[PDB]
Amino acid sequence: MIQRTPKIQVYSRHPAENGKSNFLNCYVSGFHPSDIEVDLLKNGERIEKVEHSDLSFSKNWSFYLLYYTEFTPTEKDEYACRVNHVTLSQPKIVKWDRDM
């Protein structure tokens, strides 16, 4: 057996073909086992509608999740990714840096 803690990155992107749209992204990488819970948070509250959840693996024991959705950030709102995994005794919350 092998278990690996996810790396968690939170960032925003504008699709070049539609530059006024903005997406909040949580890239959860290199984890095993594949069982996992991932949410985007807005002001501590789970975002229920997340448009894209793309899971892949490289080696049979390394998984990758891109979890993202359109959003409209205001300088007052706080966003984050929350991840639960067997390797994490407490849920891990990674805050979005607004300049990322």
Author numbering: 0 to 99
The publication says:
Beta-2 microglobulin (β2m) is a 99-residue protein, physiologically acting as the light chain of the major histocompatibility complex (MHC) class I. β2m displays a classic immunoglobulin fold, and is well conserved among vertebrates. β2m tertiary structure consists of a seven-stranded beta-sandwich; according to standard nomenclature, β-strands are named from A to G, and loops are named after the neighbouring β-strands. The characterization of β2m structure and folding dynamics gained considerable resonance when the protein was found to be responsible for Dialysis Related Amyloidosis (DRA). The mutant protein is the etiological agent of a previously unknown systemic amyloidosis, whereby patients carrying the D76N mutation accumulate large mutant β2m amyloid deposits, especially in internal organs.
Residue D59 falls in the DE-loop, which is a hot spot for β2m stability and aggregation, its side chain is not involved in any interaction with adjacent residues. Given that β2m thermodynamic stability and aggregation propensity strongly depend on DE-loop backbone geometry, expectedly the side chain substitution (D to N) does not affect β2m fold stability. Among the DE loop mutants previously studied, D59N is the first variant where only the charge of the DE-loop has been altered. Thus, the DE-loop appears to withstand removal of a negative charge without sizeable effects on β2m structure and stability. The D53N, D59N and D98N 3D-structures superimpose well with both wt β2m and the D76N mutant (RMSD values in the 0.10–0.17 and 0.63–0.73 Å range, respectively); most of the backbone structural differences, relative to wt β2m, are located in the protein region comprising loops AB, EF, CC’D and the C-terminal tail. The RMSD values suggest that the three variants match more closely the wt β2m structure than that of the highly amyloidogenic D76N mutant. The D53N, D59N and D98N variants, which match very closely the wt 3D structure, show a similar Bz-score pattern, with positive peaks corresponding to AB-, CC’D-, DE-, EF-loops, and the C-terminus. The crystal structures of D53N, D59N (this study) and of D76N variants match closely that of wt β2m.
